[PDB]
Amino acid sequence: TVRKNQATLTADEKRRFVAAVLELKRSGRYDEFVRTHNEFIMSDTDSGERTGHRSPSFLPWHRRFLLDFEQALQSVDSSVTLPYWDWSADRTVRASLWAPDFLGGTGRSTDGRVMDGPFAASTGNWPINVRVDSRTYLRRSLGGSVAELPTRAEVESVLAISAYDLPPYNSASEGFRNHLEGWRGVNLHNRVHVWVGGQMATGVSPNDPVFWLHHAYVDKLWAEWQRRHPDSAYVPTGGTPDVVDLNETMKPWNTVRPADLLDHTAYYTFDALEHHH
């Protein structure tokens, strides 16, 4: 129940994480997470119903989605938890994240195909099945479409924003959620998807296992924000059309509300999370 910085995992932990992910893929369970994510990102819209993205529920929705995925991992190997990728620190293609013993590296220049690591198409263990085009191999172009990952100074600027979210509760909003998501401002979460490239830059982005480590760090930044702003909390708090209010339930689960997910410690802790200082 401890989520650790990817950079700190032991060789044993990397091995067990990779094996659990590959078993979810083999059994068919992994691809249904890719499919769920794609349905939500293709339906969430700024002027209509929005639940997984571009809306205040972006953070609790992804928190529950990652919990569903972690529990599936733990059904294969109970010792495995989701690691997180602090892209403000591990910001180059030579980070151990991208080593052949963990997620493998960037794609070759001809077709973006990842050529090493456990998820390379040549292994036979990572077919891309849920897809928007014919290609069936994992692709990446690290640093190709945008030069730089966010820096710690940029992250700190967003963490200082006190309001959780603001009307109109979409990609035009001021406030923490939309600056963390990245549709306005210096851009944190969206820019990382663009920097990885390949399927990570598309609606079917959970096809790349780095998806989970990216969102585990976004989820940690929500926890850091809460510690910085103990006086701020999820909004809206009732009666907002098309948006998940605090005590409303969320699709697809229907049985959990943002209110049930604000406190991560009910489900996991981090290796390090600074106290309200």
Binding site: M42, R54, V132, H193, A201, V204
Partner: protein
């Protein structure tokens, strides 16, 4: 006010746009006659399902970005 329609050959591929498990749809884009899901953001920029986190100003720009991303690959509906 939807954008205008367009039709051109971009990097060898036909891209078309027109006003009209996924969202509603006020505008349609096609790459070689296969529909490309695209979506408009509140500020008037566009994304597509092959470049979802990267707003571009117009539906033609999203079609071109998709052709760039596909590297010759057929789109799947």
């Amino acid at each position: 006010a939807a954008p205008e329609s367009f039709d051109e050959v971009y990097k060898g591929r036909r891209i078309q746009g027109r006003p009209a498990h996924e969202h509603g749809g006020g505008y349609e884009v096609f790459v070689d006659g296969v529909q490309l899901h695209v979506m408009r953001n509140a500020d008037g920029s566009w994304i597509s399902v092959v470049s979802h986190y990267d707003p571009v100003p117009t539906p033609r720009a999203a079609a071109r970005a998709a052709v760039d991303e596909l590297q010759g690959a057929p789109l799947l509906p």
